[PDB]
Design a binder for this molecule. Structure first.
Ligand SMILES: [Mg+2]
Ligand SMILES: [Mg+2]
Ligand SMILES: [Mg+2]
Ligand SMILES: [Mg+2]
Lengths: 269, 147, 95, 110, 102, 55
RNA sequence: AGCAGUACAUGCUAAGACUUCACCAGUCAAAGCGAACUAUCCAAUAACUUGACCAACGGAACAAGUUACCCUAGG
RNA sequence: CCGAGCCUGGUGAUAGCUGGUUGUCCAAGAUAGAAUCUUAGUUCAACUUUAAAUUUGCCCACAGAACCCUCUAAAUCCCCUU
């Protein structure tokens, strides 16, 4: 039964551990050996040159990337208390719980919710993502949860993922930009639950998913958590409860708001 | 709260409501309480799961009586000894997609039944020889000489 | 190949390789056939079809391409609606 | 890392289950990871050497080696090749048995 | 300055459908049972099975003017022979499996 | 300058724009063919339009 | 041998193979759909595409004589 | 020693081809091919090292591999058993 206690018991008999009797673990050190252009074939056209050019990687640096978050991962995070379903779940809460890692410098534009694990997803959540699949949306809605797709720009995404580093810069909270023209259709469509989509169409789109996948659309209005479930941030709001232009003073635990008319008009525009 | 120029209220004035986006619209629907839905999870070898939907066709109130008769003859091979029409789908890993495939199959059956002018189409190669075999079989039929 | 750049002391990527090859995350390299766009009039339909295929490189070529590119080109990417998304991971490969 | 919230029904939807209380009385103990998961990990080298590693083993590791050999020998049909690292408290097994070992260790109460 | 042509699959070897049995400039081995011919006279397996080489009586197609002229000029009683390669199907087309108990 | 055969581009009369190069004798009138047209998925008249190269 | 005849589904797609061999390139092909049913880069182009006797033919984008005044190199 | 001075710096300049390259022990360890302004060199091949995974490898019974005239013998390919 004793394996750790036996090793410590053996230590009592042996000489005092000191700098004179240490050694590295066997195999951790390779003995040094003591003596005591690439891609050129010697004249012919190199293989990597004689192959024709094709735009496999053309524009790779400008392609948008989305980290995949599965319902399995989301359910696992909720089960272990790392994401709390009783509050709105956004990028900040996902990042804070170490559920996903976002690299804005690597052209990450947010998280894309994926349907893997839909069969076993049981949590009721209000979650904001950047992209969601049809099956992933149905899995959340079938449990009484709300899923919305919102756009963050590179600057906004950096701030939302790591709020504290931003606050230490000493800049006022910026207003997040609108999606580019190409994305505008996606985020103004109720089928995607876009944050810029008409709220009136949503009921129709929500019902269509329930019919297609064979579940009864629950009435979240009757839910006790309805107020939280319908909580959403303004399209220009990076953080819940914090408006653009505000300055966060973490040292004094205060928030500074500008009263200048020109500044207020700019931030609210 | 904070409201910008792009707030949903300003962008959709006529859609301003607490329940505007979350109302349950009361309202060809297929009742999901009448159907019997079973799931057979993957073992190991197929990766795709299996979803089975079955209901008693003859006593299906939702389907029209003329339709139930047409469905019975057209899909007799699916109806079992108990008179239950059995539909199965295993085309997807997820049970949601498999169930959606079964429900879509039920909808096509009801639609196809109501469309009386069934489209004439070229027969499958299997049917072509069976037609010739059926034709020769009648050629061998004889008449009772004295009756 | 530059193993130590003059200004950063870092290995450099051979851009000639980026122009011509696609690297799947599993370590496979995809390329085009040489001359797929040239002299089609004198090529049979069967020859033209295999000339427009996307083919894999052999082991020796793949290891050479790996050395000529830095780690950035080997990272996993999550492009939206990527046509080669499914090919990045191998399946049922015993080896 | 937050402590897992208490649930009414175990296992949870994702399959997680807490360690048994009180600890199972055995000659060895397998501690959970900092994320409250069973420390069984797949490992591979040379592109073809599939291996399973059991970490955070306390007590008589050799007792765990015999228990693992008795458990895995029916499935393989032979005694599993293993390495016992007494210093680090690690049991290394040839082949992938991470899923089977995780369920096996969960039943014991670790 | 040489090329490789000849029997890829010897007698008794197992072949899969599409395997190239032999390559030839001219007809040295003729297609037998379940052996296809390519444009270049390549012989390939049409079924999975064992390769067999036999000697069979040769009868050309009536519209093969060149070959018909040869056989018509042969002395009566003389039969031409050629080497043929065959594939003996190893597996059945399919089996009947119980799928439902309605 | 001169060749026995000429490489010329045949354009479909359907107006889809599908064209295929074809070989014809130099001393011939403009060629018209019923070549198959993928865009319309059926055979369609093809009209000789432009000389591409001389063989 | 650096071609010709003569067709215009030399359409599309796809198992499995061959190959001068190393690479590049090259070659054959069931089933299926539809028919019939007997070198690299470069330069021109809307596109589809085309073009170097690059013959030193794995082709540097583009350059000769002469030195018995010779200079340097090793064998 | 000026067929173009000398000095310093660029400069540890480049190429080419020689020469040299410093304790011990154990294990494995000798191939003879293709392209190239390339044959005094190189890179893909041949052989060769270490580690790893897995299952056959070598030797080889019968049967089998074309006519066209084969010098046609000595042999080859394939190949269970052993
Ligand atoms: Mg590892
Ligand atoms: Mg066919
Ligand atoms: Mg030795
Ligand atoms: Mg043998």
């Amino acid at each position: 039964q004793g394996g750790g206690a036996r090793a410590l018991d053996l230590l009592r008999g042996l000489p005092r551990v000191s700098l004179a009797n240490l050694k590295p673990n066997p195999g951790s050190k390779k003995p040094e050996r003591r003596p005591r252009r690439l891609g050129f074939e010697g004249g012919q056209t190199p293989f990597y040159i004689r192959i024709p050019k094709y735009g496999f990687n053309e524009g790779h640096s400008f392609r948008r990337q989305y980290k995949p978050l599965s319902l399995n991962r989301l359910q696992y995070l909720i089960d272990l208390g790392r994401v709390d379903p009783s509050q709105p779940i956004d990028l900040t809460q996902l990042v804070n719980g170490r559920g996903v890692t976002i690299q804005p410098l690597k052209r990450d534009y947010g998280v894309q919710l994926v349907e893997e694990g839909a069969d076993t997803f049981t949590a009721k959540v209000n979650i904001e993502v950047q992209l969601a699949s049809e099956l992933a949306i149905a899995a959340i809605e079938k449990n009484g949860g709300v899923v919305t797709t919102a756009f963050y720009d590179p600057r906004s995404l950096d701030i939302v993922c790591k709020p504290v580093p931003f606050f230490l810069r000493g800049q006022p909270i910026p207003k997040r930009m609108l999606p580019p023209e190409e994305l505008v259709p996606y985020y103004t469509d109720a089928k995607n639950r876009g944050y810029l989509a008409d709220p009136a169409k949503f009921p129709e789109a929500r019902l269509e998913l329930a019919r297609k996948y064979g579940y009864i659309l629950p009435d979240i209005t009757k839910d006790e958590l309805f107020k939280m479930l319908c909580t959403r941030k303004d399209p220009r709001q990076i953080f819940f409860g914090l408006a653009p232009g505000w300055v966060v003073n973490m040292a004094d635990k205060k928030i500074l708001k500008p009263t200048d008319e020109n500044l207020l008009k700019y931030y609210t525009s | 709260e904070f409201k910008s120029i792009y707030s949903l209220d300003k962008l959709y004035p006529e859609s301003q409501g607490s329940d505007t986006a979350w109302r349950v619209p009361n309202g060809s629907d297929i009742p999901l309480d009448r159907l019997t839905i079973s799931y057979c999870r993957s073992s190991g070898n197929k990766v795709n799961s299996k979803a089975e939907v079955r209901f008693h066709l003859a006593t299906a109130e939702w389907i029209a009586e003329p339709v139930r008769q047409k469905i019975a003859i057209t899909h007799k091979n699916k109806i079992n000894r108990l008179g239950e029409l059995i539909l199965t789908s295993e085309s997807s890993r997820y049970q949601f997609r498999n169930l959606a495939d079964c429900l879509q199959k039920i909808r096509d059956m009801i639609t196809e039944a109501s469309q009386t002018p069934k489209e004439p189409t070229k027969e499958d190669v299997k049917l072509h020889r069976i037609r010739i075999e059926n034709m020769n079989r009648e050629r061998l039929r004889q008449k009772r000489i004295h009756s | 190949l530059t193993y130590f750049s003059a200004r950063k002391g870092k290995r450099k990527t051979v851009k000639a390789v980026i122009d011509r090859f696609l690297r799947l995350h599993c370590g496979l390299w995809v390329r085009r056939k040489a001359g797929y766009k040239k002299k089609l009039w004198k090529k049979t339909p069967a020859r033209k079809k295999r000339l427009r295929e996307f083919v894999f490189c052999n082991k020796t070529q793949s290891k050479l391409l790996d050395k000529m590119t830095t780690s950035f080109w080997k990272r996993r990417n999550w492009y939206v609606d990527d046509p080669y998304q499914k090919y990045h991971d191998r399946t049922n490969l015993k080896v | 890392i937050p402590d897992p919230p208490k649930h009414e029904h175990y296992p949870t939807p994702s399959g997680w289950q807490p360690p048994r209380d009180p600890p199972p009385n055995l000659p060895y103990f397998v501690r959970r990871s900092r994320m409250h998961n069973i420390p069984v990990y797949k490992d591979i080298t040379h592109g073809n050497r599939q291996m399973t590693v059991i970490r955070k083993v306390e007590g008589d590791i050799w007792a765990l080696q015999k228990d693992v050999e008795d458990f895995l020998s029916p499935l393989l049909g032979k005694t599993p090749v293993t390495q016992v690292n007494e210093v680090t408290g690690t049991l290394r097994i040839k082949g992938y048995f991470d899923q089977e070992l995780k369920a096996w260790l969960l039943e014991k109460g670790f | 300055s040489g090329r490789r042509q000849g029997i890829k699959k010897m007698e008794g070897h197992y072949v899969h459908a599409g395997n190239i049995i032999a390559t030839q400039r001219h007809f040295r081995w003729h297609p037998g049972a379940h052996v296809g011919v390519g444009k270049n006279k390549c012989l390939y397996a049409l079924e999975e099975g064992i390769v067999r080489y036999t000697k069979e009586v040769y009868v050309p197609h009536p519209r093969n003017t060149e070959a018909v002229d040869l056989i018509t000029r042969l002395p009566k009683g003389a039969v031409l022979y050629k080497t043929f390669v065959h594939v003996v199907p190893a597996k059945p087309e399919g089996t009947f499996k119980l799928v439902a108990m309605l | 300058s001169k060749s026995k055969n000429i490489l010329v581009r045949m354009v479909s009369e359907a107006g889809t724009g599908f064209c295929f190069n074809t070989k014809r004798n130099r001393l011939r009138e403009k060629l018209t063919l019923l070549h198959y047209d993928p865009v319309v998925k059926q055979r369609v008249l093809f009209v000789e339009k432009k000389k591409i190269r001389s063989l």
